[PDB]
């Protein structure tokens, strides 16, 4: 199995700079939505993606999940070390969603409100859980999935890599030929619904699909940095 991918990142129409970072290679897809004043979010997302990049070089083998886990923790430690060197960066952090492929298996690591999706046999499923305030309220039965869509704090992030102790979610999944994956920052999914994302993901060529996702986000106002990685598994 091989990966045919397209990655696209845009500042949007509002923000002064782009604090999303993204990696896409032969076996690793990774997306980090950074935050922090004075472009410190660029630093956090860069540091975490750089720590994961080496996972692209070799077949993971036995402990694919432990290797993903170690890379994420190494990125988180790099943030802590960078804050030590320049204490004015305190507060900076980033989400991370990444998939590492190994034949008919993949490892998924996730923290924050970036998203991973699978499109398989015409059906779209979100394979990550949002660390947002509305997700906390849904888990407690305080609101319904429907009221979450209009809640003023619906994009509010509750957990991220900030250089402190963290436990990201690690999942092993089955991967199939014909699958299409999407990684995205909340700059896509805040303005664009899953119904619309699905239509864009059925565009045959991966680069045209990714372009369309960015276009739709910008048509919804482009309030945030928007980043996507669209990838196909083929024979
Ligand atoms: Mn950001
Ligand atoms: Mn958000
Ligand atoms: Mn964002």
Q: How far is CA 215 from the centre of its chain?
A: 18
**Residues at Cβ < 5 Å from ligand 3 ion:** 33, 185-187, 224
- Technique employed here was X-ray
> In angstroms, what CA-CA distances link 177 with 19, 20, 154, 174?
33, 29, 34, 10
161 alpha carbon – ligand 3 mean position (Å): 14
Whether the CB-CB separation of 30 and 110 falls below 8 Å is answered with no
Tally of CB atoms within 10 A around 57: 10
Which ligand is nearest to the Cα of residue 35, counting in written order? 1
Residue 137, both tokens: 């309220």
- Residue 58 marked ligand-binding: no
Residues paired with 70 in a beta bridge: none
From the CA of 217, the nearest ligand is 3
Distance, in Å, from the CA atom of 83 to the CA atom of 147, rounded to the nearest integer, reads 38
- Return the number of other C-beta atoms located less than 10 Å from residue 26's C-beta: 10
Q: Please check whether residue 159 is in contact with residue 95, taking contact to mean a CB–CB distance below 8 angstroms.
A: no
Within 13 Å, how many C-alpha atoms sit on residue 4's CB side? 14
Please tell me whether 224 is known to bind a ligand: yes
Q: How many domains does the chain have?
A: 1
DSSP code per residue over the chain = -EEEEEEEEE--SS-SS--EEEEE-SSEEEEEEEE-TTTHHHHHHHHHHHHHGGGGSS---TTHHHHHHHHHHHHHHHHHHHHHH-GGGTT-EE-EEEEEEETTEEEEEEESS-EEEEEETTEEEE-S---BHHHHHHHTTSS-TTGGGT-TTTT-B---BSSS----EEEEEE--TT-EEEEE-HHHHTTS-HHHHHHHHTSSSHHHHHHHHHHHHHHTT--S-EEEEEEEEE-
Contacts with 22 (C-beta within 8 Å, 6 or more apart), sequence order? 7, 9, 30, 31, 32, 49, 183, 227, 229
What is the whole-number distance in angstroms between the Cα of residue 11 and the centre of ligand 3? 10
CA–CA separation, 171 and 110 (whole Å): 9
- Residues near ion ligand 1 (Cβ under 5 Å): 19, 33, 35
Return the ligand number nearest the Cα of 155: 2
CA distance 61 to 147: 43
* Farthest-apart Cα atoms in the chain, separation: 49
Tell me if 163 is assigned to a ligand binding site.
Answer: no
User: Of 176, 190, 182, which Cα lies nearest the Cα of 148?
Assistant: 190
The torsion angles phi and psi of 20, rounded to 5 degrees, stand at: -75, 145
Residue 155 annotated as part of some ligand binding site? yes
> Tokens standing for 192?
């664009």
Task: Assign residue 76 the CATH number of its domain.
Answer: 3.60.40.10
Domain assignment of residue 216, given as a range: 1-235
């Amino acid at each position: 199995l091989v990966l045919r991918y397209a990655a696209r990142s845009d500042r949007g129409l509002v923000r002064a700079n782009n604090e999303d970072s993204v990696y896409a290679g032969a076996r690793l897809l990774a997306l980090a939505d950074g935050m922090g004043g004075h472009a410190a979010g660029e630093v956090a997302s860069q540091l975490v993606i750089a720590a994961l990049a080496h996972l692209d070089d070799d077949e993971p083998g036995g402990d694919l999940l432990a290797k993903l886990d170690a890379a994420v923790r190494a990125g988180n430690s790099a943030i802590a070390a960078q804050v030590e060197m320049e204490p004015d960066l305190e507060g900076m952090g980033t989400t991370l969603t990444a998939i590492l492929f190994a034949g008919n298996r993949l490892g998924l690591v996730h923290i924050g409100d970036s998203r991973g999706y699978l499109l398989r046999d015409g059906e779209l499923t979100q394979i990550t859980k949002d660390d947002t305030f509305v997700q906390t309220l849904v888990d407690e039965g305080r609101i319904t999935p429907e009221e979450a869509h209009s809640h003023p704090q619906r994009s509010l992030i509750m957990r991220a890599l900030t250089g402190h102790e963290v436990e990201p979610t690690l999942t092993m999944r089955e991967a199939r030929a014909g699958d299409r994956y999407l990684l995205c920052s909340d700059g896509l999914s805040d303005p664009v619904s899953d119904e619309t994302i699905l239509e864009a993901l059925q565009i045959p060529e991966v680069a045209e699909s990714a372009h369309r996702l960015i276009e739709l986000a910008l048509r919804g106002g482009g309030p945030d940095n928007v980043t996507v990685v669209v990838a196909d598994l083929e024979h």
